[PDB]
Amino acid sequence: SRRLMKELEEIRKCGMKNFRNIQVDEANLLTWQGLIVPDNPPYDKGAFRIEINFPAEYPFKPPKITFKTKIYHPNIDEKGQVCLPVISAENWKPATKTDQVIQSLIALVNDPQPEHPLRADLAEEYSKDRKKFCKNAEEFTKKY
């Protein structure tokens, strides 16, 4: 609750890379709305809206990310559950500010880590074909 002040009010802090946002609800700042604008891979121009959700017990608990705008990515499920380590516990640290959480995911988009794919499907189609993926994705990106 508290800490969401200084970080957020720290938006006028230059124009970062790939992220327009604001409070989807407007009331108790525990749910953020936004857009990550990728820059290289198949997700090339076809932005995505994201909803950040950190529990009242933030910063002692990590926030959880959910894609609002569908995406063809290995490390993400249809249900939108993202899986970036920096926040998924057994890594989480109280000091890491949300500047790192976003950005970190942006990197996970710009470079999928099919190590432990949240969908073995697109993983194999990604590793054993950096084409039959970029096409079938940039075409899913362009539409959705």
Partner 1 sequence: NPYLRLKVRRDHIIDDALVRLEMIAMENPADLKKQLYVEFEGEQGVDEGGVSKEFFQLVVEEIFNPDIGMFTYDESTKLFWFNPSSFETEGQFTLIGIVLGLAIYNNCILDVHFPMVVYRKLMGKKGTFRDLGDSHPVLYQSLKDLLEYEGNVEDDMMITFQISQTDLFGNPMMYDLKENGDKIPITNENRKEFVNLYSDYILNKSVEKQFKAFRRGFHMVTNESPLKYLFRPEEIELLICGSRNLDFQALEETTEYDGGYTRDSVLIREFWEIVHSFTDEQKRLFLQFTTGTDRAPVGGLGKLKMIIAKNGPDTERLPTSHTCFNVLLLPEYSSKEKLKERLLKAITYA
Residues marked as catalytic: 83
Would you give the binding string for partner 1 spanning residues 9-38, x where CB under 8 A is met?
A: -------------------x-xx-------
Region of 59 (left: φ > 0; alpha: ψ -120 to 50; beta: rest) is alpha
At closest approach, how far in Å is the CB of 102 from partner 1? 19
Work out the burial of residue 71: count CB atoms within 10 Å of its CB; fewer than 13 is exposed, 13-18 middle, 19 or more buried: buried
Is 127 an interacting residue with respect to partner 1 (CB under 8 A)? no
- Which range in 10-18, 65-73, 85-93, 135-143 contacts partner 1 by CB under 8 A? 85-93
* 1, 20, 135, 142: which one binds partner 1 (CB under 8 A): 1
Work out the burial of residue 124: count CB atoms within 10 Å of its CB; fewer than 13 is exposed, 13-18 middle, 19 or more buried: middle
Of 125, 126, 116, nearest to 41 by C-alpha is: 126
Coil, helix or strand at residue 106: helix
Is 107 an interacting residue with respect to partner 1 (CB under 8 A)? no
Which residues are near partner 1 by CB under 8 A?
1-3, 6, 28, 30-31, 53, 55-57, 59-62, 89, 92-95
